[PDB]
Every structure is written in C-alpha cells, then in structure tokens.
Write a protein that binds this ligand. Structure first.
Ligand SMILES: NC(=[NH2+])NCCC[C@H](N)C(=O)O
Length: 243
C-alpha cells in the first residue's frame, strides 16, 4: 500500500521544516531571536495535531533541493512558489496563499512603468526564479542586467546603494515593509501571479496526504484564517480552493 514517507516521520516523531529565517511575516527572527511567522504558526500547530515535533531548520535557499532530496529536511516553507518547472522537481501541497512578484524602485526617481526598467540593473534573490519572472516581461528580455543576492536585506541595500536600479520582491512578505517604507516605489504592473505551497520530496505522497488532511481541518476550523488575520490583518488563506 502506501509509500513509507508518513511512517518515517511518525517513527522519528518529528518533521524537519527548512526555512529561510529572514523572510518577513512568514518566517523571521523576533526580538528574542526566535523564529516566528505565518508559516511557523501553521507548521507548529499542524505538528502538534499530528503528535510530532516541528523542527524549523534554517537553510541556504540555493541548497533547498539537495537538502530535501538527501533528507536533511522533510519539506520547504518560507514562501515557496509553485512554478511549472518545480512541478518536475517537487511534490507540492495544495496552495495556501496567492502571491505576486513586484518591482520596487526608489520613489524619488520617477519610475512608473516596467518599460522604464530597460537597460537597467535589477536585483533578485538567488534561486527564486526571479530572473525567470523578469525574462518573461517583453520589455525586459535581453535588456536587463540581473544581480542575484543571498538575502532580502541585500536587495534593499543595493537599491539604497545604486548597485541596482530596481529589485524583485514577493508581495506577500512585503505587505508591512512597503506599507511603511514609502521611500520606495512599486511599479504598478506586477511581473507574475503565483501561488505559495509547501514543497516535499517527489515520492512522499503519504506524508503530503497526511499534512494536507490536517491543513484542511485547520483551515475549516478557522485556525489558519485567524493566523492570517494575526500576521496580515485579514484572512488570505486559499486552502479551500481546489486545484
Ligand atoms: N528565501 C526565501 N524563502 N525567500 C522568500 C521568497 C521565496 C520565493 N517565493 C521562492 O519560492 O523561491
């Protein structure tokens, strides 16, 4: 019958959740240096209901596929986007948030349209398919220099520096940042529309099915909607959407 991926997690009585521990709202360090956030609240309660211990393991984002496939982690959170390419590399659970990639500039520069990004340098977080998102904007293919950086803070530093003229960020983890830092301008047109998921090893169907069953319970009983209201100010959960 089932593949042993759930059994393995139940026997260890633990789920190792790989995260980037600097993603605002979703998985970041609070003043006490504890990892907190929307994704953390979800997996902490999910593992509680499953009778297993959640282990939030800080990873290097660029290594996430290797760490997962070699078993260092069991799944990947921190705002993991569904892409068509990634469907060939990961088993992804039913999406839980919508997201969009947006382009941010310095506000005092008059950037209004994506077309004004031509012949510019744009910074993206490495291994986030942000380069692919930009290369899919007609105005920008073959007319942009893309700089890949290791953290989100580095993007804003380059934007403050003049090392780049714009950056790509995800709307979801930017909702507080750009509500409050209006030294920055968002180009009206987003460059992608996406879903966030939690990524698992391809073969691990029984583990993902177990996880999805509990996520559904936690969404219907308003636990996750209320986590969303806590972190975002409204209920953004889309776990009752059927894909
Ligand atoms: N290092 C992070 N987790 N950054 C947050 C954005 C991640 C991006 N949506 C991705 O799937 O690659």
């Amino acid at each position: 019958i089932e593949d042993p991926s759930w059994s393995k997690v139940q026997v260890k009585s633990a789920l190792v959740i790989g995260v980037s521990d600097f993603v605002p709202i979703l998985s970041f360090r609070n003043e006490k240096n504890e990892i907190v956030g929307y994704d953390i609240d979800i997996f902490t309660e999910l593992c509680r209901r499953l009778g297993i211990h959640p282990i939030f393991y800080p990873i290097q984002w660029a290594q996430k596929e290797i760490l997962l496939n070699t078993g260092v982690i069991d799944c990947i959170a921190s705002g993991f986007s569904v892409t068509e390419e990634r469907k060939q590399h990961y088993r992804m659970c039913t999406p839980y948030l919508q997201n969009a990639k947006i382009v941010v500039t310095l506000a005092g520069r008059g950037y209004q349209t994506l077309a004004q990004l031509q012949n510019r340098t744009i910074a993206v977080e490495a291994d986030t398919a942000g380069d692919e998102a930009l290369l899919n904007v007609e105005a920008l293919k073959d007319h942009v220099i893309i700089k890949a950086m290791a953290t989100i803070d580095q993007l804003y530093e380059a934007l403050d520096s003049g090392t780049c003229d714009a950056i790509v960020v995800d709307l979801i983890y930017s909702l507080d940042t750009l509500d409050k830092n209006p030294q920055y301008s968002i180009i009206n047109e987003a460059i992608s529309t996406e879903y966030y998921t939690f990524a698992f090893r391809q073969a691990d169907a029984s583990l993902v099915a177990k996880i999805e069953s509990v996520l559904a319970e936690m969404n219907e009983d308003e636990t996750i909607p209320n986590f969303s209201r806590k972190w975002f100010g409204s209920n953004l959960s889309i776990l009752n959407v059927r894909f």
